[PDB]
Amino acid sequence: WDVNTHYWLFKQAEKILAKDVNHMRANLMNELKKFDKQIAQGIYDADHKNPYYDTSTFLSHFYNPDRDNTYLPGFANAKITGAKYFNQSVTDYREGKFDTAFYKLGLAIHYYTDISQPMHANNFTAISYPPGYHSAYENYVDTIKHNYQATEDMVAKRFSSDDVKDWLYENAKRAKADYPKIVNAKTKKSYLVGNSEWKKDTVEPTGARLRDSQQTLAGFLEFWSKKTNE
Amino acid sequence: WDVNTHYWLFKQAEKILAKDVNHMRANLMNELKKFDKQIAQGIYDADHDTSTFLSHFYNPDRDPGFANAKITGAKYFNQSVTDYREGKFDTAFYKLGLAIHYYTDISQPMHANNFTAISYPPGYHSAYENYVDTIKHNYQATEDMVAKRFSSDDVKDWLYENAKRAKADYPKIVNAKTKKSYLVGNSEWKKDTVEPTGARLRDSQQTLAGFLEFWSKKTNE
Ligand SMILES: [Fe+3]
Ligand SMILES: [Fe+3]
Ligand SMILES: [Fe+3]
Ligand SMILES: [Fe+3]
Ligand SMILES: [Zn+2]
C-alpha cells in the first residue's frame, strides 16, 4: 500500500475496536493512544526507509503464500520479518520495555498490512509487467482510501491460531484471492494505453480489500494484546 | 464528575503542562507540586443547602439570587489571584482548588444542562458519574495533547466556553436510548456512553491545563 495508507489502516482498525468496546479492548485502546507516536514511527520507518536499502529489504515486503515456502538465508520475506517484529514486541512488552515494544508493533503492523495488498501477495513488483503499475496503483489507492473508512457493520476478524506466522499467511491468502481484480488483461491494457479505466475497474475491489484489511488488522491488534496478556 | 474524577482531571492537566514545560511555565509546575495538598483539599471541599447545590450547575444558554457554577467558579478564581498577589499562598492555592472544581464540573454535560440527581430518570446522573470514575483511567493524558486556551481576559468567558463544549455533548450522554437502557436495567448505556465520555474527559483535561496556565499568567502579570 507522502502516501499514508498504512497508518490510515491502523487508524481505521482503532475505530473498529473503539466502536464495540469491551474490557480487554479498553485497555488495549488506552495503550495504542498513549504510544501512538512510537507505533506511527515504526509504521513510517518500515514504510519509507526499509524498502529502499537493498533487494533483501525490498523482498521483505512481499510474501506469496503459495510459493515462499523455505527461507533462503539472507532473503527474509514479509511473513518471516513480520513475525520477527511481532514476537519481539510481545517479549519486550512483557519485560516492560514499552517504548521499544510499541515501536516494533508499528513495524509488525507495516508488514502485516503490506501483504494485505494483492500485488504483495503475488510477487508483483514495480518492475513486473507493466512496469510502473504497482506504484501507480498504490498512489491511486492513497487518493481514494478516504471513501472506505471503517463502518458500523465491521468487526475485528480473527484467524484460528496462536502463532502470528499463520495470521500473516491467512492475511496474504485473502489478498492473493483478490489479485485477479487488480491485475488482469483489462487493467494492464488500460494502464498501458494511458486511460483511467483501470482506476474505475479497481476502485470498488480496492475498497473491499481495504475494508477487509482494516478488519483483519483490528483482529491482529487484539491478538497482539492477547499475546502480551498470556 | 470516593469518586475522584475531579482531582484526576487536575493530575492529567498537570501532566499536559509538565510535558511541554519551558522556563516560563517552570515556576507554576513547582507551585502545583508544593501546594498539591491545598489544591486537592480545595477540590475535595467544593464537592461536599440549595445555594451550594445550584452552584454546581451552569446552563450557558440560560439567564434566582443564587449563584451558578460560572459565578461561583469565577468568584474563587478571581479571589485566588488576589490572594496570590498579596502573598497568601496557602489560601491562594486552596481557592484555586475550589475554582478547579467548579470549572471541571461544567465540563460534565449534565452539569451544563440542568440535569441533576432528581432529573428524570432519577439516579441516572449519579450512575453515570460513578461509571465515569471506574473507566477514566483508560483516558489518561497522552503526548499529543496540548493546553487549550480561550480568547478572553475574563475567567467568566472561560467558564462559559467550557460549559458550551460540554453541553454540545449532552445528547451523547442523555437521550432516548440511554434513558431507556438505564430504566430497563441493562448496561447498554455504559457501552453507548464510553467513547463520548472518553472524548469529553480528554477535552476537559486540555481545557483545564489552559485554565491553569491562564491562572498563572494572571498571578504573575
Ligand atoms: Fe505498502
Ligand atoms: Fe507496494
Ligand atoms: Fe462533579
Ligand atoms: Fe454531578
Ligand atoms: Zn460540584
Residue numbers in the entry:
A (entry chain B): 1, 10 to 238
B (entry chain A): 1, 10 to 56, 62 to 76, 81 to 238
Paper text:
Of all the constructs, LmPC-PLCC143S+C168S had the highest solubility and successfully produced crystals. Therefore, to determine the crystal structure of LmPC-PLCC143S+C168S (referred to as the crystal structure of LmPC-PLC in the rest of the text), we used X-rays with a wavelength of 1.26 Å near the absorption edge of Zn, based on previous studies suggesting that three Zn ions are in the active site of LmPC-PLC26 and the Bc and Cp homologs. LmPC-PLC crystallized in space group P212121 with two molecules, molA and molB, in the asymmetric unit, whose structures were determined at 2 Å resolution. Three metal ions were found bound to the active site in molA, and only two in molB. Interestingly, while the strength of the anomalous signal at the metal ion position 3 was comparable between the anomalous difference maps of 1.26 Å and 1.33 Å data, the anomalous signal at metal ion position 2 was significantly weaker in the anomalous difference map of the data collected at 1.33 Å, suggesting that the metal ion position 2 may contain Fe ions in some molecules and Zn ions in others. The absence of a pronounced electron density in the anomalous difference map in molB at metal position 1 and the shorter distance between H69 and H118 than in molA indicated that no Zn or other metal ion was present at this position in molB. A glycerol molecule was bound in the active site of both molecules, originating from either the bacterial growth medium or the cell lysis buffer. Interestingly, the N-terminal residue W1 is well defined by electron density in both LmPC-PLC structures, while there was no traceable density for the following residues S2 to T9 connecting W1 to the αA-helix. LmPC-PLC molB, with its partially occluded active site by the D55-S64 loop and the absence of Zn1, could represent the closed, inactive state, and molA with a more open active site due to the flexibility of the D55-S64 loop and Zn ion in place, could represent the open, active state.
